[PDB]
Structure formats: C-alpha cells, structure tokens
Amino acid sequence: AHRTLLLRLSDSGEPVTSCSYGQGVLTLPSLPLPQGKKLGDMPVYTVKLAIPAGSPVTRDGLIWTNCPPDFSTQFDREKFYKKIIKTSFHEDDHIDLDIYVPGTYCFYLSFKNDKDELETTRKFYFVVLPILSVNDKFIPLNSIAMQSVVSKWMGPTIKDWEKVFARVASKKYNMIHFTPLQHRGESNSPYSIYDQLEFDPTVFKSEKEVADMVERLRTEHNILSLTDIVFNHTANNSQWLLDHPEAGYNHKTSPHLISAIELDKKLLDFSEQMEALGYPVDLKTVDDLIKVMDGIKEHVIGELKLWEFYVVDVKQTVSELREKWGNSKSWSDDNIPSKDDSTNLAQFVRDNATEPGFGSLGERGSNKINIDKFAAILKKLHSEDYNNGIEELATKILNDINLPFYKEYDDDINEVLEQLFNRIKYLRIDDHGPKQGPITKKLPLSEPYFTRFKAKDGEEYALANNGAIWDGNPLVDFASSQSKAYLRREVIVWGDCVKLRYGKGPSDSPYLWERMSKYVEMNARIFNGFRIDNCHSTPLHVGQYFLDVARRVNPNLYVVAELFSGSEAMDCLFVERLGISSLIREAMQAWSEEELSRLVHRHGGRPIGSYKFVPLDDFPYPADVKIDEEYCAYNPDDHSVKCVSEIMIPKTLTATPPHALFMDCTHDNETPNQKRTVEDTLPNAALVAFCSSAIGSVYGYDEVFPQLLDLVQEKRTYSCAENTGISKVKTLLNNMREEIASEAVDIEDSEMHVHHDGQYITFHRTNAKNGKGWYLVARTKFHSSGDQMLPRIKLSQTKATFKAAFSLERTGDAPISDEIIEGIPTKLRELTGFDIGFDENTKETSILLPQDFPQGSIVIFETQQLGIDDSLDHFIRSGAIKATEKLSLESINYVLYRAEQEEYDYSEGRSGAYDIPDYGKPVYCGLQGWVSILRKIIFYNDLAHPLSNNLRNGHWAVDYVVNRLDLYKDKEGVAEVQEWLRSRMERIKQLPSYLVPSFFALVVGIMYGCCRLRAMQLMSDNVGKSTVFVQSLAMTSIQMVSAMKSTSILPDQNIAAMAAGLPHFSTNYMRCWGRDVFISLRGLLLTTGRYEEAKEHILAFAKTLKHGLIPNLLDAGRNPRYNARDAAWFFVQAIQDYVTIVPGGVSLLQEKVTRRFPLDDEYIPYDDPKAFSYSSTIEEIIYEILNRHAGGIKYREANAGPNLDRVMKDEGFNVEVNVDWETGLIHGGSQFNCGTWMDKMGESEKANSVGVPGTPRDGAAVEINGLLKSCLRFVLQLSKDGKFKYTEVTKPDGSKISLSSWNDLLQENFERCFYVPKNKEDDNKFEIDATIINRRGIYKDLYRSGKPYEDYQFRPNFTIAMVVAPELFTPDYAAGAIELADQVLRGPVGMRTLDPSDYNYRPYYNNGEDSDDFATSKGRNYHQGPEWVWCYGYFIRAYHYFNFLTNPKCQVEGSAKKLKPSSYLYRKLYSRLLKHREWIENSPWAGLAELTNKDGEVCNDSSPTQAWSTGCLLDLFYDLWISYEE
Ligand SMILES: OC[C@H]1O[C@H](O[C@H]2[C@H](O)[C@@H](O)[C@@H](O[C@H]3[C@H](O)[C@@H](O)[C@@H](O[C@H]4[C@H](O)[C@@H](O)[C@@H](O[C@H]5[C@H](O)[C@@H](O)[C@@H](O)O[C@@H]5CO)O[C@@H]4CO)O[C@@H]3CO)O[C@@H]2CO)[C@H](O)[C@@H](O)[C@@H]1O
C-alpha cells in the first residue's frame, strides 16, 4: 500500500531533523511485510528525498546511493547508482529510493561547485531493520526476549540441550543467544575457537546436525536463535595458524612488536630461573616483590642492550663515517644551523640524513643515519679532513639527537615496571584476586604476551594475543603500529586467544578474509542473527564487509553488539555503517538505586504527554497532492506507515536513538548474589522487562545461581531443576509484553514516567494511542538497609487494577555439587493488601502499599487513562479537510491570522489575542499565532514551556480557539471550520490535564495544514506547486486581504481591503494606502490568482480620482488625502499588470465606476448628492490622468489646515505637478512637500524639524517618469489593438501633443536628464553639474530637485523605472548602474534608502528620538539609510533582467534555441534571497518586515509584516516563471 517515508534535505544535501530525539540514526521502523508477501514482491520501503529548489546542490546535481535498483541486483557497498536532480527555481524535486531488502544503505550528492568544479557531500546512512518472524507470526523488535546459554554447560548430548530449551520456552523467551558452538581451543574457553569452519565434535558433526537443531527450536518452542561471532581473535592452537601464520601480527607483518617479543620471552626465561638466580618466588611481602623487581631490573632490563631500538648507535656511526669519508661530499645550504645552536643543529641532521622510518620502531637498530649525507654536512660545517675534530663533533651531534630518544626510553621503562609490579601484587598478594600459587610454567611471573610455535613453512613465529587497555580508546588497534601497549606492558591479555591481523582489505591477509567469510556465511545459513563481543575493537571496514556477506546469505540478519565506543556519536556511526540493529545495555552496571533508575529512564521511553509531530509552516503544501479525505485509506493487513493527518505528506524519516537490548544480567557480569543480594533478582528483572525495548537474561539469573560461572574453567552442567526462582514471573513478564507488542509501533507511541525514592523504583509504562498502561512498584535489595515506607501513590485521571505481586525470599545457601550447577533455594510468595482508592469526583487513583512488602518484591497494576479509547486518534486526524471545503482566500485570513488590532475591530475592543501567562500574546489571534510558537515546542518536547503549563492548568486556550470564530462565523466556510474545532476541542477537554498540551497542538496543527493547503489550491499553479519560501510569501496575501468594520475600500459597503502592514497599518484610515496597494497588487493578487479581488481595488480607487491623481491615504472613499504624486502612476501600472496577466483583462477598461467627487476638482461632497453623480470608465480614468498632467494642474490641499496635517506648513499644502514638454518629464513638489513614497514629515520640536520633510522629492522623480513611459507604451499598443481610443493630449496653453510624440520625447530625453556618465568627458552630454556629484555611473534619483544635491543622491528608486520601462535604458549603462547598487545600496534583507557615503546617512530608525539631531529626531531618518524590503524586489527584478542582456555567462540556450538564464545567474539570484528565506522562517509574523536598520539589524518600530515587502519578491518569481517555465 503506502510504505513511504519523506527525507527532506538541506541546501547542502544533509538530512533535516524533524524532531530532537537526541544523537541517533536514520532507522526505518520494523514492520511485517504485507499479507502474504515475501522479499522481492514489492519494495519494503521507499525513501522520498526532497531537494530544495534552487539550492547550490541542484546545479548539475546527482543523487548517489548504493541501493540496488531491483531485487535481482545484489548489494554492493561501493557500487553507487545515478539519479538525476531536476533543477528548478520554483519546484522542489523528489527522488524515490526503492528498498527491497534490509541492510545498510547510504547516499551522497555530487554537484557543480561555484568554482565550476566537482564537489561531494558526506555519505549519509540509513538502516532498514530485518523482519523477524518465527513460523508465520511477526515478532516486533522491541518484544524480543533473549536467553543467553553457554554451550559447554548444557550437556554432552543434543537431547541434553533440548531439555534446557523446554525450560526457557516455558519462561516464554522467544530468542536464544548461543556462545559460539564451534570446536573450542586449548583452554576450552567458548571464545577461543579452535576451528571456525566446523562445530563442536563433542555434540555435532556437520552443518545439517546443528541446522536441524535450530530449525527444531523454531517449530517446537517458537524460538529464534543467534550466536556470538568472533572477529578479533582465534585460539592459540589452530592447525591453520601453522599453515597461515600471517593471519596475525608477527615480526614480519607487524615489525614494531619485535621489541615487545624479545621482552616477553625474556620475562618467561627469568621465571624459569627465578629462585635459581634470586629467591622470592611466592611470598606476600611488598619487600619480597621489590627484590624480584630489582632482579627483573638486572636480569632482563639490563641484559636488553640499553635498547638500541630508540637510540642511534653512536660509535658504530663514527666507525661508518670514516669508511665513506670521501664519497658524496659537500653541501650548499647556508641554513645549516651553527654548531653553537646544539639542539637546533641536532634536529637538522634528523630531517636530512636519515634512512626511511626514523624514530618509529622496527628491528634492533632500525633508526640509523644516512652516512654520505651526514659526512657531507660535516665537511661543509667544520672541515673536509676527518681528524679535524670530527669524532668529537659527530659524536656530540649524535648524542644530542638521542637525548629525546633516551627520555623517551626512561618514560617507557618506568611504565613497564609500574604496570608489572602493580599487576604482580594483585595477581599474587590477594587484594581482591587470590591464587598466589608458586610460579610455574602454567602460572609464570609474566602473563603470556605472545603465542610461540613452529609453522609449517619452517620458520618460527610469535603471534601475540589481544585483550584490552585499561582506560584506552578502543577505536585504536593496540596491536597496530600506532600503539605502544604491548611494549609498555599496558595490556590485560587473554592467553586463550591469538591476534587476527586484518589489513586495509583482503590484500594484506588473503587467507584470513577468505576463511572468516566462509565462517560468517556458515552461521548465517543456520541462525537468525549474530552477536558481536567487543564490537568497538573490531575495525569498521572489517565489520562492514563480513556483516554484508552475512546479509547476502540471510537478508533478515539480526545484529547485536556490546558497543561502548568513545561517545554516543561514535556509537551511532558504528550502528549507521555496520547495520547494527540492537545495542547491549547491562542492568548490573548500576552501582546504586539512583543509577538503576537513570539507566531504566534512558531505555524506558518518552515523557507522558509528549508532543506529536505535525507538518506546520515549514512544509510545502502542493495543491496537486493526494489526500485521505477522512483518514480511511489504511488497511491493517497492508502494514503501511501512516501519514500524520488527512494530507498525505508521508511520515518523516528522522534520526532516532539506536535500539537497545536491555540485559538484566549478561554472561560476564557478577550475579546479584555477588554484587547485591539474591532478593534483588525479582525487582531488577521487572524494571528491565518494563522498558520499551528488547530484553534478555543469562541462564542462571532466573534460577538464582550463586556466583558468576567461569567461562574458562568450569565444567559442571545446568541443573534440570524446573521452575526455580523467577521462572514463574518471567513467564508473566514475557507474556504481558506479547499482548503489548501487537499495537505499539513508533517512538511517539510509547511513553513513560520513572520515579526513584530511596530503595523503591516506580515505573509507569504508557501507550499513547489507547491509554492502556502498566504501573510497577519494585522495592530493590541492593543491601538490607532497614525498613522504608513509600508515600501514597497518586495517579490523575486514571483507574488502576491489581495484576500480580510477588516477593523473593532466601531459604538458606545453595547446595555444593561437583557435577551440576544448582541455584539458591528461594521462596516466591504472592503478596496482598494493596489498597486502590479511586475518587469518583477528582477521578484520582490512590495506591497504598502494605506493610508486608519486603525488599526484593514487586507489584504490577494495570491502568487506563480516562477519556482515551482506541478511536481517539482517528477522530482527531479526520474531518478537517471536509470542514475547510467552503473556505475562501479571504475567509482563511480570519482562521489563521488577524492581528490584535484587527480583532479589536470586529469585537469592538473586547476580545483580542489570548494572553499566555509568563509569556505574552501570540502574534496572530488565529492558528498561525499558535503554530509560530508551537513549532519550536513540538521540536524540543518542551513540556515546561509557559504555553505547555497553561494548557494543562486549564481549558482556557482550548475554548479560546473555538470562541474566536463567533466574530467571523457568517463568513464562507468559517462556521464549518469552527464546528470541527468545537467537536475536537470538546473531546480533548475530557482527557487528563497533562495530555491536553500534546493534543491541543495536534488539533491546531492539523487544521492549520488543511487551511494552508486550501489556500494553495485556491491560488494559481505557480504558487500551488512551489517551495515553502514561495508559498510562505503567498500566504502574506491572505494576511493583508480581509473585511473590516472600521474601514474598507468602498464608502458604501464593508468588503475586503488590503492592509498596508500588520499591525500598525490595519484599522481605520491607516489601513489602505493607494501607493502601497498597487505596488503589491501584482505580487499579492495577480501572481496568486486573486483576479476578482484585484479588480475590486482598481475600481474602488478609480472612484476617488481628483486633480487627475490617485490619493495615497484612502479613507475608504470619503475625504481621501491627495498628497501623492506617486500613487497615480503606480495605479496606472497596476491596470497594465492586470490587463497583461488576467485572461480577458481588457474587460477592465470598460468597467464603469461611479466617480465620487466632481470632475472639476470641486469640494468634499460626501453628503452632497453630486457625489455619486456621474460614472467613469477605466479607459477614461487612464486618459484623465495622462491628459490632466499634460494640461497642467493646480490645487491647494482640500480642507487645508492643521486639521489634516498638524505639522505641514501653510505653503506645503499647495503642491503641484507640471510636465516640462522640452523633455517630457513630469516635475512636481516643493521643499515643503512629501509627494513620493519617501514621505517622512518632521515632528520634532527640540531639533526643530516640524514641517521640514526628511526627503522631499520635488521635480522629476524617476519612478513617476518611468511609470509614465510604461503607461504611454501601454496605451499606444492598446490603441493599435483597438481597446484604447484617446490619442491626443492637451497643453497648459491649449496646444495638442500626440501620445506617441510624448512617448518618443521620454525615449529621447529620459536617460539624458538622469544618467550620470562615468566618463567625466561626457558631462557635456548628460546635463550634469560636476560640482555636486557623489559617484558616477548612477541614474539620478531626482531631476530639478529643490536641493540639487538630492538629484545626484544614490537611492534605490531608479530600479522601479528600470523594471517598468526598460526601453529608457541603454543596456551597458544600466547594467553597470545596478551593479553599483548591489555593492553599495543592497542590504541583506532590505534596500538602503541612501548611499552610505553621504553626510546625511543615518541608518537607524527611532520614531521616539526626542534629541536635538535635525536629521535623526522623531524619525526623520526614515528614508535616509534604513533598509526597506520592497525596493529589494524591484532591484533584483531588474538585476536579473539586465544581467541577462549584458553578462553572457548569465545566458544559456537549449529548448527551441531560446535564451533561458544560466545556472550561473540562478545561483546569483538564489544567493540574494537566503536572508529573506531565513527571515520569514524565523519570524513570529509569517512574512517579511517593512523596514530594517543598518546591515540586517532589526528595527523595533518597523512593521514586522508588510504587504509590498513580500509582494515585490513574488513579482520576481512570476518573471522567472512566466518567461522560462514553459
Ligand atoms: O481623521 C483621520 C485623520 O486625519 C488627520 O490625518 C493626518 C495625520 O495626523 C498627519 O500626521 C499626516 O499623516 C502622515 C504622517 O504625518 C507622515 O509622517 C506619514 O506617515 C508615516 C510616519 O511619518 C512615520 O514615522 C511612520 O509612522 C509609523 C511607524 O513607523 C510605525 O512603526 C508605527 O508606529 O505606526 C506609525 C504610524 O502610525 O510611518 C507613517 C506611514 O509611512 O504620512 C502620513 C499620511 O500622509 O496627514 C494625515 C492627513 O489625513 C489627523 O491628523 C489624524 O489624527 C486623523 O486620525
């Protein structure tokens, strides 16, 4: 059915962590195959790799993976297969990895670097767990019960073993771990294997004899089997070691140990003559040890030649100097240090005259000097005659060379004898280890460091035996050359075993690899898995190769390993590459009760009430996605991995901590009788069994054996004594876990609470799906530490039920047999008296323990949380799609967004945003305000967050989500969305308090995702199929477009009205701004597909035309403000954008609006019946604007006075606009004016700037004239097409100018008036006064401005003209001008409003400055430095266009030999948007800010989400889409 996981990648190709589970591994969940399907019928899993669109990896990117393409192809570690990444600047690419067999798989990505070179990422691994079934019933991995049994103690016959099998089958174990069933070595230790290729001749004779026994265990007792596999060593007496001695490290293969060999055999030879030469051979005196130690120092250390292994043979070099004194002589280097600089000169000879392998160990005299290169230096330094003091000089240098070697030797020898005498004392003088037997050949003074034999090749050899350094790093091969442990005697050896020298591969030890391969696949044919002792000491490449050979034989190979590497990260890396399925954890390692509770806490599960993962505002919502319309397209027999909700965003693949196999007692740790007591066997095994993981135990733990069995010496047999000790309880524990294994699946599905009080440990196991749980009270018996009484146990919203209770008591000591291992007689008394009180009001269960509850007892309760059934998850994960069926792009605004001021508008100031105690209010009143806070809470499982606390303290926030929508109930689809929230929140309130936060976030997140998907479906295809970033920008369109009560766009009605920004531009007269609306109209409405809403705004403002101008401040169409020389031309540009994009958009031209205010610019007539009066068409409105500007205007502001602008000066109200017909440019404004977008008016009385505009842009503005040229080009081609008529324009006098002539006037005179030529020679060609110019290569920001220094100021406004009227610019001039803006005026997120190299540059906006600075106080800086985000949109839109015309590297051909941008240009475009993608990702408001201080510094006064900040970035994506993506 659906076994697909989503693995989103970052921009560098690294997997993305969906949740913080800790240091882990990309493990895929263990699940059975579909009903009646084998390996190969279908892929076991499919990993969907998601690559971000436009990321640097997509540039000629390829996905590599060693996953075979089909089931027929075998797995190869190093054969990777190609997968093509489909590059796009809008759409992310998904590449499936079909997996057919469990194993270790990895993937890496290759791409084209920014250096045009090839680059590769890391290898990223992910494990598919094996499928474990017994007959035809699936065994979940966390329900495995493993019984470890030692072969040589189960009996001499196979039937003697099958009696043990029946005992562990009654205890209901489902897996048996075997110590290696091979022929054992001399010492008969199970791990020193004599021959790897044949089993124990005492019991078996062939593979079929042991294969039938394991298959018998499967069919008879329903038990799987696995063995230990020994890679690190073999027995010291293998008949194949005589044939192939190179399989270990010897004097040939590892020459560095030659020094250690001659020391081991010396020590043993001294042991033979210990009392002969000296006498102390077996005493308990520390002085007696000192005598033999001094004997060692004089009988071995002194007889070992002062160790020439380090030091250079001084006199033997001088002897050889005279010999070749006269051959390759003379040097030339003048750097040769002076003879006075002894140390410096000493090491100079070391670097130049040495034979290969200097300083390192080898043979006796392996470190020597190159003579012809040494004597050549002496001739150059001293004299060419030898007897001239060379013997003194040469010896002096060599003696100083050996100074570090001698100190290296003293430090080595000291750690030899310290290690020796310390070990000698312990091994002899019983401190904690006795057996101080008079030394013998079997018990020599020194433990055997090397195994000696005479090989079949004739020569003698000395293979050592591995072991372990005390506290050394196990990742270091102590037998390799990097370690000096065998020399310094820092090795605790195992004489039973012998080295196994693997190299870099089969080339270094051919027979060893071939033999171990056939040895591995032999056990792989029989058993279900392997167990690896000291896996951390086996090299990675060694473990990787043989485990893959096994999985080729047994595809469902279950791997266990005792893995204690340096850290958790190294543990995860070993699990990643080796494919380990479970890690061994030992419960006996806990020294105290607190250490045991912390161990059980690690492997118990997640906290109770843990948050559940949901796709939120960080996911793409493709409009063309499959959906579970009612979460019903799941069949249990399919065994499919479920999606999170009705939306089919597949289950995310995230790193989870590697699985654990919790052993209450292994075959190497001491018995509870030894470390603690025998009574602790019951509570210790119960706490382990309650963990949500695999569990196991050694044989004898349940049968309370007295002490740990010596794996080397002991020969006694397991007792046939049935049903002893805990065998009855383990039958209960394993049978209980079988009932739980049927439904518990993933890591979020099993939760836990653990408490430790004194000697008691509390374990509360909980299933998060149904509410079923277990409660365990276990009194531990580490020591008999007196009576302790546990306080009252209290469970909230839960009912308890007594299951079972037991006590373990000791009835004397264990029998002392010599032929059979028998345990300690123990009584297992069932307990009673547990009072379970239930308060039928508070629904609180109280549990009191009985006073007869001795140490070593347990009690199990069955529990069930109230309000949770099996049908709760389906009710929450369904119905939300059907509830959003009637939602519209306007109505989604009330469900998701609404600022508190926008909510006060509908609630008359009563409601607002929910106040979270000790935190604050969410940014939006809708779900977006919750999702912005919950995403980090769900990611970290922060149950201590103030919102998490408030959600379980009461149902206030739960009812707040549903009660808000009463304000917007009558709107499209909101009522049905409220009813879904009402029905789901009501069911949630019936749950326990501690479970409310996790379920509250799940309900909000599900409805949020359904609302965001509904938005992408209602929008166009370019948006509804793009990356998260584009969709996040498109959701801003919903934030701004909403119906209000205190304002609108029509004076008669109350309809949708695009706000300028939230929250400071949303209510009353501050919401709609004509300039702001029509800059964002193309981005927020046309790019998204809101065609009818874009028409309503064009028609609404068309009613308020006056002076031939469009008003900036729109008071819903009643008394608007006409101080906007900018708005009319952004408005006429939005009409062109509408007609160009909307199909049949020419129909807008003949739409008749009822023009309020008379044509003759009369007076404010809101009541006067001459308001409605006459109608005007849009075609007429356009011509009215063009002709009125041409014919000249003249007006003082209507209702002029402070009443409007309480700071504007009297002359400031009479603004005007006139067209210089010599040039064609439209001039207008004054030094008391703000008629452009930089409209900051002074309000400082201290700095005396009241009335003084910060940025008056009087004269010819670039944007106005650029939009004028765009409008003229629009109406010319329109009259040609017949949709426009008017072709004549008037004059202030009364003449007439053709529209084409006005169009040509700008074409002939625009660039002349504005471009500042780089050539100082062409200032006589572009109307420039060189006295006032900051930089050249700049299109002037103004023409004929009042203060002419503002004419030549570098401001970002010229980009508007470059985008809307590119014909006004010669390509080479514009390309260089916009490259300067990129280097100078471009900030990280916003565009700098003024060149930093100006004296007026003040880039920090503080609208509360009450200082004396004329330019900074009260926010006069507004447009003199601060970085605005919308100007970045117009900038990069033209930066893309003119780089496509100029730089040829930004061009590429292909389809239809049509020029599409190169990946080099897409790379430059993608880079300039990372800060914008970061901003909208990590902002509580789900948009882009209005303003930013210098260099990305957050401006507090800036509105955090602005309409035209995100709309202009949507303009860029539509340019690249509508022109290339066809
Ligand atoms: O009856 C309705 C209305 O009538 C009159 O309206 C006039 C205003 O009182 C008058 O000030 C003026 O409005 C100007 C404004 O003066 C001018 O500076 C500019 O607006 C700027 C601010 O200058 C600027 O600092 C910034 O202010 C933001 C701030 O950055 C933001 O962080 C947050 O604090 O919100 C502040 C705004 O509230 O940005 C704004 C916008 O760019 O332009 C305005 C419009 O021209 O002229 C109005 C003419 O009607 C009455 O005076 C008024 O009381 C009445 O309510």
Ligand SMILES: OC[C@H]1O[C@H](O[C@H]2[C@H](O)[C@@H](O)[C@@H](O[C@H]3[C@H](O)[C@@H](O)[C@@H](O)O[C@@H]3CO)O[C@@H]2CO)[C@H](O)[C@@H](O)[C@@H]1O
């Ligand atoms: O309608 C929901 C309501 O939620 C918020 O108010 C609640 C607090 O979040 C909640 O912790 C609790 O506060 C108590 C405090 O003693 C104190 O706040 C007092 O004024 O009210 C409670 C008295 O026990 O309960 C309140 C609601 O009573 C949020 O702030 C409200 O705006 C919101 O309406």
Ligand SMILES: OC[C@H]1O[C@H](O[C@H]2[C@H](O)[C@@H](O)[C@@H](O)O[C@@H]2CO)[C@H](O)[C@@H](O)[C@@H]1O
């Ligand atoms: O040489 C160019 C000149 O540019 C700037 O001078 C500005 C000045 O800051 C304005 O206040 C006004 O005087 O217009 C001038 C136009 O260049 C630099 O400040 C100045 O150092 C530089 O020399």
